[PDB]
Each structure stands twice: as structure tokens, then as C-alpha cells.
């Protein structure tokens, strides 16, 4: 009997004999969870859900689903004692974003779990007051069109990290060689995957010793100068730059002088040409003057920037063709991303193609599709039979035309909307 | 560098059906750097002037190379019978006099290997000539692929109902065979093969049955891949993925092993709390009997994560050991 | 930074000539017209109109690199016809076709609006 | 420097890498200057 601290456990439905104790009235009372005060704890306390830990879990005889496991048949086990609520609650927070993860190979679920932590998005709603160093905020994030049910609780419809691209899996001009992608330049001009990048610089006016006090003041050619460097003219007279000025590479942000005064001014981190966003002035714990300055830089996707799907492989952008160079459909739907076909097979990510197929059905149907892992009410045949109702090829192929010469492409291209993430990497962070 | 991009494509370009028209041919000859300004005579003059993929490729091939490879799917009963220099499936490559006469190219013919037309080019013609041969293959193939296009989609991963029934019956046979082996062990009719144990006897017998099931499903699937299938396009030119990858995508993921053995008994006498104690059936110890198109059940998903973390750890330890050995040698 | 301004895919800089002709020396009666600040729009129609002349044995175009904005059109005619005239006639016949197309579209419009 | 810009043989002018320079990343390549940032 353990009452220790640190035993990891998890809730499980109780199966007395061979019938769940979760009757229909518990569900009826939980539907009305507001204006009823019937919560989780009124379900625990009703002796219908238990917390089982990892060594109590070896004396139990779990079922995966009531609908199958405790139904009379040619008997496997008939002494079940617990039941899984949903078997997809075995997955963490970053693997609950992957759609159809029971169709990927586990190296891909692991890769994506690692890359869902690099996708830009909106990271928190009050980023307007937070002067973190290094924030990345997408302009137009979108919630996925093919989404897990475990994402309703991760608040991924409210701070989503990515955009639903139209993706064609096609060899177009060779600029999508191994993992590279071809981006639409017109989509990118229309706001696609644009980003903002904020950086904060702090400095404090410390008077540590008796002499040698640091002070904020416009240095340039004022009085008692020292080793004044390139440029000091955007500072205001309090030695701080003002919000709304455009700062370039090797440009001065805070005008600090450490007194016959040396200068210890603050410059931008080796070039970026941003715009000064916010200059807050305060006092630290010591009662010295303190200043945080946030500069803002817009980041339009480029030839180096890395994008990745929710099915775990990331690629730079090889080239960007405008809208008239892209392969179009007989409706004029040019892809947003063209990805290489020879990426898909080697990675077992059929979940990527099922995400495109379910996403096409969801965009046409006006729904948002269920990519929950262990569904069994969602096949590929059921998705195909709905895609063939909106007048498309049931397997998601589509006769594309060549944007350069206008001629059809002899093999029909697989195209559809897939949720793409803009990985935090890019290239603006290397050329400065 | 001849990556998958222009290897699948060169297997499709040199097929016997690739008839290029006059404007397409001129488009392609704009990207030959080593072209002498002469348009070859069409393979087909009447009714329509209509070149071939092997003509434009024989324009790429440098000098007067001679080579005889053998495409990947060559029936081995062909060289003996008639049609030995005819080859109804176009599986014997003969680059004679710098000029592809028959046979579909692949990486077996264009990689670097023994034979390997690019190797014979490096040996016979020179060293910048093979640089040009690489770059020419790439450019004219990229542009023909603008005309032809390559994709991968659902329906490449789907097999006709005949093959689904075949694979389901293969799996069901493997199930009931492991079931009868287990009943032997449980009634002591199993006699240990000389050398190891009775547990290792049972273990080897079961692993044998299950690996035979996985391989039979993989083959019975790849034998149903149509010629219009793009996974066949991927694999027969050896360009991308292994045929085991496509086997798992189409047929069966198969048995998951942690340190060479089936999934270990990690709870007390069972692999997960969902199974009965002392279950040696294939479902209990890690046999994933679904493809990635049908999707893995919750326990198969976990056993697959278990057995695919070994890959991730093996990768890291191998890169470390390999860098060490390389530096020590060097 | 290294972002080419968007207008330099169609705007000639000083000293660019917009077109140069090089005689191709591997074969007789072949020219190579390099046209600056053009793309497949103007290359593909000229090619497909040259391929309509019965005295043109080769017409082709290529965009050497997609990040540079220029095309190369290689023409090769029969000896009694120069590729400069084949090019000129292609452009004249395209201009004539588009003039016809413009007036036919004006008439089709003015009839659709039940004028 | 309107005065210093005269060159006569033997000087070493330290120019900017241009098309055709040979660089190494151990094999070597010929530089071609392209208009974007990778």
C-alpha cells in the first residue's frame, strides 16, 4: 500500500465483472457540466473512475474499448477489471498534434514531436507586453483542417502554429531535391507564412563604484567623449532610442557612458534592420535606472527558410515561383508548396497523404476532420468515398497543367491541403 | 551526384513507350551541353515524327562507350530461352557505340558500381566527360519530367481486393501456425532442436513463422504493384526507399524486436496490461499485422514505438563508434 | 540584404540591349538570341510560332537559371532563310494573331452585353 | 582616398570574390554569384 509522493498514475474506467460502471447517466450529467456542478471529481467520487499507478497496473486486466473488449465472443479474457478511456491518451502534448499517428513510422512521430516545438505561431496572447529576448510570431496562423481530438485541450485552436498549405507532391523543376520545397511567390506576397521577430535589449544605469558611474546620455559629439564608434544620432537626449525608428546594422540603441567618459553603448546584435517597437524605462531591485528595448523585424519566407509538415520531415525552400509559373489545376488552384515525391515512401508517412485527403474533404465539406489515432470510424476508403462526392478523384489526384507551357502533365499530381509549420530556423538568423 | 530525383525519372524516360514529339525533343536538346547541333532522325517517321527516350538518352551518353548491364527485374529464365537478344520486357541494357540500343536504365546501370555506364564512362572517356554526363542526365531529365511529372499519392499505397485477401490469408495462416506451435509447447510435443534450449527452440520457430509471413506479404504486395503505380517506380529503379518500406506501407509492418528478441515481458509475465499472463501469441509479443495504410491498433502502436526507439539509439551509438574508428584509422 | 528588388525581373539596367544575336558555329544557319528580362511568357510563344515555319529546322528556348531573368532562343533554318528573318516573321505573325484576337474579343463582348 | 587609387604592376589589390573564384568547403568549387541568401 503506497501513499508516497511521486508515483505516476492515470485514470481508468472501472469494469465490475464485464460491464463498465460508467452508465449513461454519468454522461448525461457531464454534458451539462456547467450549471450542474458535476465535474471530474463527482465521477471519481462516484467510484466509476480510478487512478491506477504503474505497479498497481500489473494486477489489473485492462480493456482498450468497451465496445469490443467486454463483448461476448470466443473468449480471450472475461475477467476485465478496468478500461481505457481513450487509447490515444497514451500520447504527450507534442505527439497529440500529429494527425493519424498510427499511420506513421515511429521515427516520424518522434521527429515531429521534436519539430512541433520549433514551429512559430502565436506563443502567448499577451506577447504585446512581454519583452522576452527572441519572440517569433506568425502573422496569420490557422487552426488545422485535420485535427486530433486531443488538441481541443492543448488549446491548439487558439494559439496555432502553422498554416494550411495547398501541397502538391510533384517533381516540378528539381528545386525540391531531397527535402526542399518550392513555394508560391505570390502566396508569400499575400501574407503566407510571414512572421515577426522581436528582440529585447536591456541595460541598467549602474553606479557601482564611487566614480566610474555608468549613465544613459547621448554620446556622439556632446562633451567629454571617449571611443565613440560608428553612429549615435538616433538616440534621444536621454540616451535611449525612441519607438518607431528604423535601426540598421551596427546602430546604437542605448547611449551609455561609463565615466573623460568611456562609452559602453549598446548596438544591435550584428545587423537585422528592425524597427524599435517598445522602450520601457523602470528601476531594478537596486533602484538604478533600467531599460528594456524591443525591436521588431518582419520575416518573409525566403530561399533558406525551413518548413515542415506535421509528419516529420523538414526542408528548406528551394525556390519560389510566382503564381503564373506554378502548375495549376483546371480551376486555377496553384499549389502553395510543392514537395518532392521521393520523400514520402522512405518515411512511412502515409499519414501525410491521408492528412491531405482528409484535408481536401474538410475544406470542401466545410468541416474539420478527425485525425484522432485509433478511430476505426475513419478509413481511407471512407475519406475517398466522400472526396468522390465533391467531384474530385477519389484518391486525391488531380490533373495539373504546366505553368510554363500550359500543357497538361501526363501523370496526375496528388494535391491537397496539408498543415505546414514554419520552423523557427530560417536563414535571416545566419546572414544577419 | 545522381540522386533519386533523376533515377526514377531515367527509368521512366528510357522505357519503351516514351515517344517524344518534335517540340518536346527540341526543348530537351536545349539542355544538352554536349550536343553537336544535329537533330537525330526520329525512331518513327510516319505517320508522326516521334522520337524515343532512348534516342535522347543515347545523345546524352558520351563518346562511344560499350556496356551491357541487366535491368533489375530481368527474368532469369530469359537468357536461356529464345528472345535473349529481344527481351520482351526490355530488361537487358546494351549501350553499344555510345548509344542506348535496348533496356531500361536504373541505378544498377547509372550508379557507380562494377559496370555502371557512368563508371565505364569515367574509365574510357575521361573525367570531365563524366561530369558533363552527370549534369546532362540531370537537366534533360528534369525537363522531361516537367512534361511527364511524377507524384506519390494514396492509391499507390492501396492494393486491389485480390491482394488484400491474399495478405489477410497469409497473416491468418501465420497466426494459426504460431497457435499450433504454442499448443505443442504447452503439451510438450516440442522437442528442442540440438544446441540451445526449449525456450529458444520455440522462440526461433515462432520468429521463423512470423518473418516468413511478413516477407510473403511484402512480396505478394510488390507483385501486385501495377506499372502505373509510383511506388513501383520508386523501388525498381532503386531510387528511393527499400522495398521493405513499401511492404510495410502496403502489406504488413511485421514483428517488432527489442534487442533481437520479441517484445520483452515488461509487466509481470505480460507485455502490456491488456494481455493475459503468459501469452506467446504474435499479438502479445509485438507482431504488427497491419500495414501503415490500415493503421496500427493501440498496442501495435506502442510495440512499434518500443521497437523503433532501438533504431534511434542504434543510430547514435553507431555514428559515435564509426567516427571513432575513422579517426583512429586516419 | 541579398533580396533582389522585385522590379529587376522586367526592368533593363543601363547597357543591356534587351536582345543579342550570336551565330551558332556548330551548325550552319543557326542563331542564338539572348533576350534580357523575359521569361516563358515571351519565349514559349516565339518558340511555338517558329515551329510553324516550314523553313525552321530547330526552334527552342531555355531559361538558363530561374533566378536570372533572361531566355535563350536557338533557331536554325534552311539555307535559303536566315534565322533573323525567321525570328522577325514569328514576332510579326504573333502580333497579327493577337491583333485579330483583340478585335474578335471586343466584338464578342459587345455582343454578349447585347449591344 | 582620391590620391591612393593608382595601381602599377606588383601591387596586390584585394578584390571581392567574383564569378569563377575557387573556394573549398575536401573538394573545391567555382563560385557563381546568385541573387538570394543561401
Amino acid at each position: 500500500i503506497y501513499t508516497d509522493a511521486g508515483r505516476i498514475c492515470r485514470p481508468l474506467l472501472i469494469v465490475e465483472k464485464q460491464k463498465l460502471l460508467l452508465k449513461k447517466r454519468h454522461i448525461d450529467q457531464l454534458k451539462e457540466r456547467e450549471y450542474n456542478n458535476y465535474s471530474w471529481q463527482d465521477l471519481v467520487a462516484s467510484g466509476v473512475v480510478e487512478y491506477i499507478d504503474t505497479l498497481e497496473e500489473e494486477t489489473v486486466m485492462l480493456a482498450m474499448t468497451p465496445d469490443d473488449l467486454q463483448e461476448k465472443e470466443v473468449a480471450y479474457c472475461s475477467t476485465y477489471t478496468h478500461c481505457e478511456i481513450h487509447p490515444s491518451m497514451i500520447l504527450g502534448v507534442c505527439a497529440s498534434i500529429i494527425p493519424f499517428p498510427d499511420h506513421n513510422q515511429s521515427p516520424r512521430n518522434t521527429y515531429q514531436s521534436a519539430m512541433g516545438k520549433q514551429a512559430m505561431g502565436v506563443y502567448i496572447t499577451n506577447f504585446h507586453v512581454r519583452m522576452d529576448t527572441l519572440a517569433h510570431v506568425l502573422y496569420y496562423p490557422q487552426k488545422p483542417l485535420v485535427t486530433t481530438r486531443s488538441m481541443e485541450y492543448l488549446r491548439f485552436r487558439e494559439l496555432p502554429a502553422g498554416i494550411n498549405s495547398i501541397v502538391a507532391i510533384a517533381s516540378y523543376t528539381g528545386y525540391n531535391q531531397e527535402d526542399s520545397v518550392i513555394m508560391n511567390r505570390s502566396a508569400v506576397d499575400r501574407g503566407f507564412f510571414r512572421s515577426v521577430f522581436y528582440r529585447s535589449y536591456k541595460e541598467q544605469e549602474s553606479k557601482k563604484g564611487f566614480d566610474q558611474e555608468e549613465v544613459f546620455e547621448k554620446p556622439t559629439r556632446e562633451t567629454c567623449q571617449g571611443m565613440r564608434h560608428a553612429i549615435y544620432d538616433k538616440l534621444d537626449d536621454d540616451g535611449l532610442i525612441a519607438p518607431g525608428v528604423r535601426v540598421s546594422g551596427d546602430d546604437v540603441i542605448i547611449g551609455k557612458t561609463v565615466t573623460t567618459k568611456r562609452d559602453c553603448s549598446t548596438f544591435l546584435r550584428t545587423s537585422e534592420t528592425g524597427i524599435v517597437d517598445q522602450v520601457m524605462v523602470t528601476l531594478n531591485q537596486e533602484g538604478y535606472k533600467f531599460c528594456k528595448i524591443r525591436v521588431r523585424s518582419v520575416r518573409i519566407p525566403q530561399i533558406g527558410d525551413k518548413f515542415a509538415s506535421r509528419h516529420g520531415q523538414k526542408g528548406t525552400c528551394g525556390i519560389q515561383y510566382r503564381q503564373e509559373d506554378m502548375p495549376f489545376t483546371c480551376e486555377g488552384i496553384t499549389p502553395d508548396i510543392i514537395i518532392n515525391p521521393h520523400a514520402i515512401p522512405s518515411r512511412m508517412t502515409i499519414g501525410h497523404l491521408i492528412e491531405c485527403l482528409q484535408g481536401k474533404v474538410s475544406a470542401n465539406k466545410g468541416e474539420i476532420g478527425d485525425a484522432t489515432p485509433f478511430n476505426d470510424a475513419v478509413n481511407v476508403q471512407k475519406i475517398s468515398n466522400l472526396l468522390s462526392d465533391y467531384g474530385y478523384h477519389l484518391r486525391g489526384n488531380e490533373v495539373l497543367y504546366n505553368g510554363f507551357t500550359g500543357r497538361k502533365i501526363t501523370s496526375q499530381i496528388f494535391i491537397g491541403p496539408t498543415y505546414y509549420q514554419r520552423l523557427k530556423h530560417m536563414v535571416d538568423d545566419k546572414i544577419h | 551526384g545522381i540522386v533519386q530525383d533523376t533515377l526514377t525519372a531515367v527509368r521512366k524516360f528510357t522505357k519503351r513507350d516514351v515517344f517524344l514529339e518534335r517540340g518536346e525533343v527540341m526543348n530537351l536538346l536545349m539542355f544538352l551541353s554536349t550536343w553537336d547541333g544535329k537533330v537525330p532522325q526520329p525512331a518513327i517517321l510516319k505517320p508522326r515524327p516521334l522520337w524515343t527516350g532512348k534516342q535522347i538518352f543515347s545523345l546524352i551518353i558520351p563518346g562511344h562507350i560499350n556496356c551491357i548491364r541487366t535491368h533489375s527485374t530481368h527474368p532469369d529464365d530469359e537468357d536461356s530461352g529464345p528472345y535473349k537478344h529481344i527481351s520482351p520486357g526490355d530488361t537487358k541494357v546494351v549501350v553499344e557505340n555510345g548509344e542506348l540500343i535496348m533496356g531500361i536504365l536504373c541505378k544498377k546501370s547509372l550508379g557507380t558500381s562494377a559496370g555502371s555506364l557512368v563508371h565505364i564512362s569515367y574509365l574510357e572517356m575521361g573525367h570531365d566527360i563524366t561530369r558533363l554526363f552527370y549534369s546532362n542526365i540531370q537537366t534533360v531529365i528534369n525537363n522531361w519530367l516537367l512534361i511527364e511529372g511524377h507524384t506519390i499519392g494514396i492509391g499507390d499505397s492501396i492494393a486491389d481486393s485480390k491482394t488484400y485477401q491474399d495478405i489477410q490469408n497469409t497473416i491468418k495462416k501465420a497466426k494459426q501456425d504460431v497457435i499450433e506451435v504454442i499448443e505443442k509447447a504447452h503439451n510438450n510435443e516440442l522437442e528442442p532442436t540440438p544446441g540451445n534450449t526449449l525456450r529458444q527452440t520455440f522462440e526461433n520457430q515462432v520468429n521463423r513463422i512470423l518473418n516468413d509471413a511478413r516477407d510473403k506479404t511484402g512480396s505478394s504486395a510488390q507483385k501486385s504493384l501495377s506499372e502505373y503505380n509510383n511506388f513501383k517506380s520508386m523501388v525498381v529503379s532503386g531510387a528511393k526507399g527499400s522495398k521493405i518500406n513499401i511492404s510495410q506501407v502496403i502489406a504488413v509492418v511485421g514483428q517488432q524486436n527489442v534487442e533481437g528478441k520479441r517484445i520483452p515481458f515488461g509487466f509481470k509475465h505480460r507485455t502490456l496490461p491488456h494481455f493475459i499472463k503468459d501469452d506467446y501469441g504474435p499479438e502479445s509479443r509485438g507482431f504488427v499485422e497491419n500495414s501503415y495504410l490500415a493503421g496500427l491498433t493501440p498496442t501495435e502502436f506502442f510495440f512499434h514505438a518500443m521497437g523503433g526507439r532501438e533504431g534511434l539509439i542504434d543510430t547514435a551509438v553507431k555514428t559515435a563508434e564509426t567516427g571513432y574508428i575513422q579517426r583512429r584509422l586516419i | 540584404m541579398n533580396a533582389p528588388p522585385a522590379f529587376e525581373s522586367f526592368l533593363l539596367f543601363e547597357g543591356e540591349k534587351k536582345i543579342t544575336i550570336n551565330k551558332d558555329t556548330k551548325v550552319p544557319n543557326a542563331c542564338l538570341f539572348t533576350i534580357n528580362k523575359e521569361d516563358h511568357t515571351l519565349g514559349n510563344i516565339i518558340k511555338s510560332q517558329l515551329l510553324k515555319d516550314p523553313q525552321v529546322l530547330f526552334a527552342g528556348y531555355k531559361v538558363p537559371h530561374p533566378l536570372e531573368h533572361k531566355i535563350i532562343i536557338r533557331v536554325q533554318t534552311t539555307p535559303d532563310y536566315s534565322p533573323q528573318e525567321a525570328f522577325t516573321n514569328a514576332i510579326t505573325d504573333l502580333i497579327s494573331e493577337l491583333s485579330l484576337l483583340e478585335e474578335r474579343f471586343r466584338v464578342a463582348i459587345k455582343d454578349k452585353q447585347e449591344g | 582616398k582620391p590620391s591612393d587609387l593608382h595601381l602599377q604592376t606588383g601591387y596586390k589589390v584585394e578584390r571581392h570574390m567574383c564569378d569563377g573564384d575557387i573556394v573549398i568547403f575536401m573538394m573545391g568549387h567555382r563560385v557563381r554569384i546568385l541573387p538570394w541568401s543561401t
Binding site: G174, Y175, Q177 | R131 | N2 | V23, R32, S37, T38
Partner: peptide, 25 residues
């Protein structure tokens, strides 16, 4: 000694060339 930039593909270069931005150059 460059700014360790990314490497993207370019099938229009000769296999003996590298494409260098005008800022690395």
C-alpha cells in the same frame, strides 16, 4: 570563414559550382 549559411539545392549549377550570395561574396 563564411557566415555558415544554409545549403539549398540548385539543379541549374554545374556539379563543380557553388552559388554564393552577394553578401557572402
Amino acid at each position: 570563414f563564411s557566415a555558415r549559411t544554409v545549403i539549398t539545392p540548385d539543379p541549374n549549377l554545374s556539379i563543380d559550382q557553388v552559388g554564393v550570395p552577394r553578401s557572402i561574396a
